[PDB]
Paper text:
The Gag polyprotein, composed of MA, CA, SP1, NC, SP2, and P6 domains, is the sole viral component needed for the assembly and release of an immature virus particle, which is accomplished by the oligomerization of Gag into a lattice structure at the plasma membrane. Cryo-electron tomography (cryo-ET) data has revealed that the immature Gag lattice forms a spherical cage of interconnected hexamers where the CA protein plays a critical role in stabilizing the spherical hexameric lattice before the viral protease cleaves the Gag polyprotein into its individual subunits and maturation occurs. CA is composed of two domains, the N-terminal domain (NTD) and the C-terminal domain (CTD). By contrast, the immature CA hexamer is stabilized by both CTD-CTD and NTD-NTD interactions and adopts a more extended conformation with a six-helix bundle at the base of the CA-SP1 domains, and the immature lattice is stabilized by NTD-NTD interactions that mediate the inter-hexamer contacts.
LEN binds the immature GagCA-SP1 lattice in a novel binding pocket consisting of three different CANTD protomers, two from one hexamer (denoted chain #1 and #2) and the other from a neighboring hexamer (denoted chain #3). This is a unique binding manner compared to that of LEN binding the mature CA lattice, which is composed of the NTD of one CA protomer (chain #1) and mostly the CTD of the adjacent CA protomer from the same hexamer. By contrast, the additional, distinct CANTD interactions in the immature lattice (chains #2 and #3) cause conformational changes in LEN. The unique binding of LEN across three CANTD also suggests that it modulates the NTD-NTD interactions between CA subunits both within and between immature hexamers. The binding of LEN induces a conformational change to the GagCA-SP1 lattice structure, consistent with its multi-protomer binding site. However, an ~8° reorientation of the CANTD relative to the CACTD takes place upon LEN binding, which induces an overall conformational change of the CANTD layer in the immature GagCA-SP1 lattice. By contrast, the interfaces in the CACTD remain unchanged, including the hydrophobic interfaces in the CA-SP1 six-helix bundle, regardless of whether additional binding with BVM occurs or not. Notably, residue R18 mediates the interactions at the juncture of three CANTD protomers and participates in the interaction with LEN, highlighting its key role in LEN binding and lattice dynamics. By contrast, in the immature Gag lattice, LEN engages three CANTD chains, two within a hexamer and one from a neighboring hexamer. This binding mode allows LEN to bind to the immature Gag lattice with a unique mechanism whereby only the CANTD interfaces are involved, independent of the CACTD-SP1 layer of the immature Gag lattice. Since R18 plays a pivotal role in maturation by coordinating the IP6 molecule within the mature CA hexamer, its sequestration by LEN may disrupt maturation.
Residue numbers in the entry:
A (entry chain D), B (entry chain A), C (entry chain P), D (entry chain B), E (entry chain C): 11 to 239
Write the structure that this text describes.
Amino acid sequence: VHQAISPRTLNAWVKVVEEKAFSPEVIPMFSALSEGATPQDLNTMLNTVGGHQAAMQMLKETINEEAAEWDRLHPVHAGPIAPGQMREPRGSDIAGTTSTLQEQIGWMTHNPPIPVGEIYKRWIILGLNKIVRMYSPTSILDIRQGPKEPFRDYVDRFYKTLRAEQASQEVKNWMTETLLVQNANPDCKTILKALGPGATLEEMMTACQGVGGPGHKARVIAEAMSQVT
Amino acid sequence: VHQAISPRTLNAWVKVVEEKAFSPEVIPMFSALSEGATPQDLNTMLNTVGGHQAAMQMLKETINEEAAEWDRLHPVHAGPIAPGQMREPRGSDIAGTTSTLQEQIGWMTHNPPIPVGEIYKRWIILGLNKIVRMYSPTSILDIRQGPKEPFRDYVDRFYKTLRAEQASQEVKNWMTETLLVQNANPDCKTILKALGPGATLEEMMTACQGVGGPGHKARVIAEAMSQVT
Amino acid sequence: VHQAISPRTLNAWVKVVEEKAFSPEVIPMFSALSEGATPQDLNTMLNTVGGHQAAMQMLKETINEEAAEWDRLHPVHAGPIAPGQMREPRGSDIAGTTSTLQEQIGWMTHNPPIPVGEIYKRWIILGLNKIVRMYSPTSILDIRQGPKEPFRDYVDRFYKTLRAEQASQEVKNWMTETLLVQNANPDCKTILKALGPGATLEEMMTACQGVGGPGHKARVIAEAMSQVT
Amino acid sequence: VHQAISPRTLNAWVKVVEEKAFSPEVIPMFSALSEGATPQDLNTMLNTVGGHQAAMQMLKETINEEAAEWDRLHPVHAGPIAPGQMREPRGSDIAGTTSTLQEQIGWMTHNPPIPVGEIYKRWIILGLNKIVRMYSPTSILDIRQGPKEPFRDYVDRFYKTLRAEQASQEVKNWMTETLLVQNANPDCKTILKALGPGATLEEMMTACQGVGGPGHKARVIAEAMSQVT
Amino acid sequence: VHQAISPRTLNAWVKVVEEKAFSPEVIPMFSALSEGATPQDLNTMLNTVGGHQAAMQMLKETINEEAAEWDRLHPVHAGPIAPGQMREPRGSDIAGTTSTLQEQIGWMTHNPPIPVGEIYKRWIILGLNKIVRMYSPTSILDIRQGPKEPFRDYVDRFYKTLRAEQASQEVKNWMTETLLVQNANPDCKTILKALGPGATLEEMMTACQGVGGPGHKARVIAEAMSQVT
Ligand SMILES: CC(C)(C#Cc1ccc(-c2ccc(Cl)c3c(NS(C)(=O)=O)nn(CC(F)(F)F)c23)c([C@H](Cc2cc(F)cc(F)c2)NC(=O)Cn2nc(C(F)(F)F)c3c2C(F)(F)[C@@H]2C[C@H]32)n1)S(C)(=O)=O
Ligand SMILES: CC(C)(C#Cc1ccc(-c2ccc(Cl)c3c(NS(C)(=O)=O)nn(CC(F)(F)F)c23)c([C@H](Cc2cc(F)cc(F)c2)NC(=O)Cn2nc(C(F)(F)F)c3c2C(F)(F)[C@@H]2C[C@H]32)n1)S(C)(=O)=O
Ligand SMILES: CC(C)(C#Cc1ccc(-c2ccc(Cl)c3c(NS(C)(=O)=O)nn(CC(F)(F)F)c23)c([C@H](Cc2cc(F)cc(F)c2)NC(=O)Cn2nc(C(F)(F)F)c3c2C(F)(F)[C@@H]2C[C@H]32)n1)S(C)(=O)=O
Ligand SMILES: CC(C)(C#Cc1ccc(-c2ccc(Cl)c3c(NS(C)(=O)=O)nn(CC(F)(F)F)c23)c([C@H](Cc2cc(F)cc(F)c2)NC(=O)Cn2nc(C(F)(F)F)c3c2C(F)(F)[C@@H]2C[C@H]32)n1)S(C)(=O)=O
Ligand SMILES: CC(C)(C#Cc1ccc(-c2ccc(Cl)c3c(NS(C)(=O)=O)nn(CC(F)(F)F)c23)c([C@H](Cc2cc(F)cc(F)c2)NC(=O)Cn2nc(C(F)(F)F)c3c2C(F)(F)[C@@H]2C[C@H]32)n1)S(C)(=O)=O
Ligand SMILES: O=P(O)(O)O[C@H]1[C@H](OP(=O)(O)O)[C@@H](OP(=O)(O)O)[C@H](OP(=O)(O)O)[C@@H](OP(=O)(O)O)[C@H]1OP(=O)(O)O
Ligand SMILES: O=P(O)(O)O[C@H]1[C@H](OP(=O)(O)O)[C@@H](OP(=O)(O)O)[C@H](OP(=O)(O)O)[C@@H](OP(=O)(O)O)[C@H]1OP(=O)(O)O
C-alpha cells in the first residue's frame, strides 16, 4: 500500500520500545507510526519488541479477545461464493494470522473499505493500554535479599534478573560488582564486608552459607548478650 | 425504542457506580435507571463499570447461570421457519451476546411481547444482589503489615492495592505518605520512626531489610533482657 | 394434583429448615411434608433452603448419582412414538430438570402409575441423610484464634463466619462485642484487655499487630525471665 | 459499522477517565480508542465521564463553537435533495445532536465519504486540550482554613469538596478524620488540639465558634502580653 | 386505569416524603408506589410533596431537560393522522403538562404501547437521584451564630429556619427556648447567661446589641489584660 511502513518508521518503533519500554508514551507513538499500515506491518512492528515476553503475551490475549468480539458481531456468510466480491474478514484475518498481505490490501482498498489495519490497530492499542496499566518489567535494582532468604537463593534471583536486564555486558558486570553485595540483607552484609574487597562469588556464598543456621544464630545471640551485659 | 437510556440516565448510572460502588443502594438505582431498556442498553450500562472486575466477573457468571435456566425452560423448536413470525429468543439472546438491537426491539414490541429487557434486568439484579452480599472491594486502608511479614512484601501489597484504589494521584501520594508507615508492624515502625521524616522508600526498605533476620532478633532480645535486668 | 403442597406445608418446611438446620429431625419432616408431591413441588421445597449452600451442593450430587442409577436401570426405548401412551421418564425427568409439571402429573396419574414424586423423594432422602451424617454448619462460636495465628487473619475468619451466621443484625453486633475478644488467643487477649473497654476494631488490630514479631517475643521472654529471677 | 466501539474499548475509556482524570494522557487514549467510531459512539464515550461536570461543560462549549465554524464553512443548500443523494451534514449532525446513527453511517460510508466521526473527534480533541490546559479538579487536600475564615465556613467547604471527591466512603471517612483538623488555621487548630481526640464535629464547631470574636481576640492578646512580660 | 394510584398508595407516598425527606430510600419507594401509573398520578404524587420547594424546583429542571431530550429523539411529524390514529406524544405530553388523562391512557393502552407513565417516572427518578445526591434540607440544629455575626442577624436566621422547619408548634417553641441561646457565639452566650432565665427575646437582643462594638471590645480587652496582670 501507500502507507506501508518505511525503514525509518520501523526503526523508530524499535527505538521507541527499547528506550521507553511500556511507558504511556508508547501508545501515541505506535498510533502515529502505524497509521494506514496493513495488519502485516503491525505484526512486523509487534515482532520486533525484544524482551517483555509477558507483556507481549498479555497483548496477544487482548488481541484474541477483540478478535472473538469481532467474530461475534460478524457472522460467517451462508457460503455465497460472490466471485465479483471477496470473502468477508474474520477476526483472525484482521489480526493477520489467517490472512495474507494481498487479502488485507484488498479489504483496505475495496469500496466500501474494510479498514482491517485500523481495526487491528485499535485491538493492539487496547492491549498496549492494558500493558501500560498493569505490566511492570523486572528491574535488577529491585532485587533485594529477604531478611530470612538464604544468600544463594538471593544470588540466583539476582543473576536471573540480570540475565533478563536490558544493559550492556560491561554494565551488567558493574551491576554485579555493586548491587549484589549492596542489596544483601544486613546479616549477610556484615559477613560480606568483613570478607573484604576482592572476594569471589564462591567465597561470598561460602561465607554466607551458614546465615540462618543454628551456629550463626547462637553466635549473633551471644554477641548481643555480651554487648548488653 | 421509546425507553432507550438517555445521556443523563447513562451518566447517572456511571456516577452511581463510582460513588456507591456495590452498596445495596446500587440495586434500586439500576432498577430505576434501566426500566424499559433493551438488553443492549443494559450491556452498555454494565460496560461502564470501571474497576471491580472481580465483581463484574461474578455478575457475568450469574447471568450465564440464568441464561442456562432460561434455555432449560425454553426448548429450541424443530426448525419451523414461520416467516410471518420471528425466531424465539435464547438465553444468550436475552443477555444480548447473540442478538442484535433490532431483534431485541422486535421481541420487545411483538404481540404478545417477550420482554427480553426485563428478563435480562432480573438476571442482572440477581448478579448485583450476589455482588452486594459477597463482594468486598479492596481498600488501601486495610493493608497492614503482618507481624512476621517482611517489609518489602508489605510494600508490594500496599502499592498493588494503591494502584487498584479509586482516588486521584495527589490523594494516592498522600496515602503513600501516611498509611504506609502508619500501617507497618511495630518492629518496622520503630525503625522507620528512627529514620525520621524525609526518608525515601528505598532507605525505608533498606532500614527494615533485616527485621526477622538473626541479627535483628538477637539485638531486640538482648535489649529486652538488658531492660529487665 | 390433589396432593400439591399447600401454603402452610411450604411455610412449615421453610420453618423446619430455619430452626432445625440439618439435624436428623429434618428427614421425617420432609418425608411427612412432601408425600404425594410432584417433583416440581419437591424442587420448590429444595429452593427455599436459605444458606447451607455446601449441604445443598451435596444433595444435588446425591440426586445426580441416583438419577444416573435410574438411567442405568431404565434404557431408552428404540424410538417408538406410541401416541396412545407417553414417553418414559428418565432420571432428569424424575429430578424435574427436564420435565414439566404436566408431564410429572401424567406419569403420576397414568395406569400403571410411575410415582416420579416418590422416587425423587427417596433420592432427596438419601441426600438429606448424607447431609445429616457428614455436613456440619459453620458456627461463630467455633471461631477461635490459633496460638500462632495473627490477629488480623483471625478477625477476617471471624467476620466471614459472622456474615454466614444465621442471626439478626443486633445479635451479630452482640456476637462481635463478645466473642471476638473472648475467643482470641492468650497473647492477644492480654493486649486487648490492657486496651480496656471502648477500643475500636482498628485499635485492637493495631495493638496486636506485633504479636509473633521479634520485638514482642523478646519482650515476653524478658518479662518471664525477670519474673522467674 | 466495522469500527464501532467494543465493550472493552468503552470500558478502557471509562477507566482512563477514572484513573487519569484530565491529564494530557487523556488526549492520545481518546484519539486511539475512538478511531473510526461514529458520532453516536463518541457521544456514548463522552456521557460515561462521571464527575468533572464543569470540564464537560467546557467541552460542550468547544463543540458548539466548532459546530458553528462548520456551519459557517458549509452553507445550507436551498431546494430538495436528489432522491439518491442524502442531506449534507450540519454541525449538529456531526456532533450527533440532530442526526441518527443511520445518517452518520450513511455519511461515513459514502462516495466520497464525509467522515463525520473524525470531524467530531477533532472537535472533541480541541475541547479536551482546552480542558487539559485550563481545568483543575477540586481536591480535598487543598481545602485549608483561611486565617480569618470562621471554622464553620471552612467545615462547609471541606464537606462540599469531600462530597465531590472521587474516593471510597471509607477513604472519605479517613479524610474527614485527618485533613479537617490538620488543615484548620492555627487559631482554630490550637483549640481543636486542646479538645483532645474523640471530639465530635459539633463539639469542634462550638469550641471554635468564638475564634475571631472580641473575647477570643482579647484573650489571645492578653496571653501574648503576659508571655512578653 | 387498572394501575391507577389507590388512596392508600397516595397516602403512603405522602408519609414517605414526610418521614424520610429525600434520603435514598425515597427512590425505591417512589419506584414501587408509582408502577403502572399515568403521568397525572405521578404529578399528583409530586404535588403532594410539602416543603422542599428548592428540591422540587431541581426535579422540575431535570424533568424539563429529559423532555427536551425526548423531543430531540422524536421529531414532530406533519400530523396527517387518521381519525383512528392519535398524535404522537411529546416531552410535555409525557410530563403531563400538555396532555390530558385520556391521552395518556390512550398512549399507554395502544398497540404498540407508548408507556408515557414509565418514561415520565424515569425522568422523575433522575430528578430524585439528583436531589438525593445534591439537595440538603435546612436544619434548625445547624443555625449557629458566627463569631462576628450580630446577635439580631443570628436571631433572624434562626427564626427563618424555624419557620421552615418541619415540626409541631410546641416543638418549635421548645426549639426556640433550647437552641437559640445554646447556639449563640461565646460572647453573646456569656452575656445571655448573665442575663439569667426568664428574659424575653427583646431583652436578649438588647443585651447583645453592643457585642462587637467599640465599648464592648474595649471592655473585654480591659478584663483580659487585668486578668493576666
Ligand atoms: C512474516 C511476518 C510478516 C509476520 C507475521 C505475524 C502474523 C501473525 C502474528 C499473530 C498476530 C496476532 C495473533 Cl492474535 C497471533 C497468534 N495468536 S495465538 C494462536 O494465540 O498464539 N499467533 N500469531 C502467530 C501466527 F499467526 F504466526 F501463528 C499471531 C504475528 C505475531 C505478532 C505479535 C507479536 C507479539 F509479541 C504479540 C502479539 F500480540 C502479536 N508474532 C507472534 O505471534 C510470535 N510471537 N508471539 C509472542 C508472544 F506469545 F509472546 F506474545 C511473541 C512473539 C515474538 F515476536 F517472538 C516476540 C517475543 C514475543 N506475526 S514478520 C516480518 O513479522 O516476521
Ligand atoms: C457494543 C455494545 C452495545 C455492547 C455490548 C455487550 C454485549 C454482550 C455483553 C455480554 C453480556 C452478557 C454475557 Cl453473559 C456476556 C458474555 N458471556 S461469556 C462468553 O462468559 O464471557 N460475553 N459477553 C461479551 C460478548 F457478548 F461481547 F461476547 C457478554 C456485554 C458485556 C456487558 C457486561 C459487562 C460486565 F462487566 C459484566 C457482565 F455480566 C456483562 N460486556 C463484556 O462482556 C466485556 N466485559 N466482561 C467483563 C468481565 F468478564 F469482567 F465481567 C468486563 C467487561 C468490561 F466491560 F470490559 C469490564 C471490565 C469488565 N456487552 S457497548 C456500547 O457496550 O460496547
Ligand atoms: C420454577 C420452580 C418450580 C423450579 C425448579 C427446579 C428444577 C430443577 C431443580 C434441579 C433439581 C435437581 C437437579 Cl439434580 C438439578 C440440577 N442438576 S445440575 C445440572 O448438576 O446442577 N440443576 N437443577 C437446576 C435446573 F434444573 F434448573 F437446571 C436441578 C431445581 C433445584 C432444586 C434443588 C435445590 C437445591 F438447593 C439442591 C438440589 F439438589 C435441588 N434448584 C437449583 O438447582 C438452584 N440451586 N442449586 C443449588 C446448589 F447448587 F447449591 F445445590 C442451590 C440452588 C438454590 F436454590 F439457589 C439454593 C442455594 C442453592 N429447581 S421454583 C418455584 O422452585 O423456582
Ligand atoms: C443515547 C446515546 C446514544 C446518546 C447521545 C448523545 C447525543 C448528543 C450529545 C450532545 C453532543 C454534543 C452537543 Cl454539542 C450536545 C448538546 N449541545 S447543547 C444544546 O448546548 O447542550 N446537547 N447534547 C445533548 C442532546 F443531544 F441530547 F441535546 C449534545 C450527547 C452528550 C455527549 C456529551 C457529554 C458531555 F459530558 C459533554 C459533551 F460535550 C458531550 N451528552 C450530553 O449532552 C449530556 N450531558 N451534558 C453535559 C454537560 F453539559 F455538562 F457537558 C453532561 C452530560 C452528562 F453526560 F450527563 C455528564 C455530566 C455531563 N449524547 S447514549 C448510549 O450515549 O446515552
Ligand atoms: C390536575 C392535577 C392532577 C395535576 C397536575 C400537574 C401537571 C403538570 C405538572 C408539571 C409537571 C412537569 C413539569 Cl416539567 C411542569 C411544569 N414545567 S415549567 C413550564 O417549567 O414550570 N409546569 N407544570 C405545571 C403546569 F403543568 F401546570 F404548567 C409541570 C404538575 C406539577 C408536578 C410537579 C411538582 C413538583 F413539586 C415538581 C415537579 F417537577 C413536578 N406540579 C407543579 O408544577 C406545581 N409546583 N411546581 C413546583 C416547583 F416549581 F417547585 F417544582 C412546586 C409545585 C407545588 F406542588 F406547589 C409544590 C411546591 C412545589 N402537576 S392536580 C394534583 O393539580 O389536581
Ligand atoms: O516464631 P515461631 O512461630 O515460634 O517460629 C520459630 C522461629 O521462627 P521466627 O523467625 O518467627 O522466630 C524459627 O525461625 P528462625 O528465626 O530460626 O529462622 C524456627 O527455627 P528454624 O527455622 O531454624 O527451624 C523455630 O523452629 P524450631 O523451634 O522448631 O527450631 C520456630 O519455633 P517453633 O517451631 O518452636 O514455633
Ligand atoms: O478583627 P478584624 O475583622 O480582623 O478587623 C479589625 C477590626 O475588627 P474588630 O473591631 O471587630 O476587632 C476593625 O473592624 P471594625 O472596627 O469596623 O469592626 C478594623 O477597623 P478599625 O481600625 O476601624 O478598628 C481593623 O482595622 P484594619 O481593617 O484597618 O486592619 C481591623 O484590624 P486588623 O485587620 O489588624 O485585625
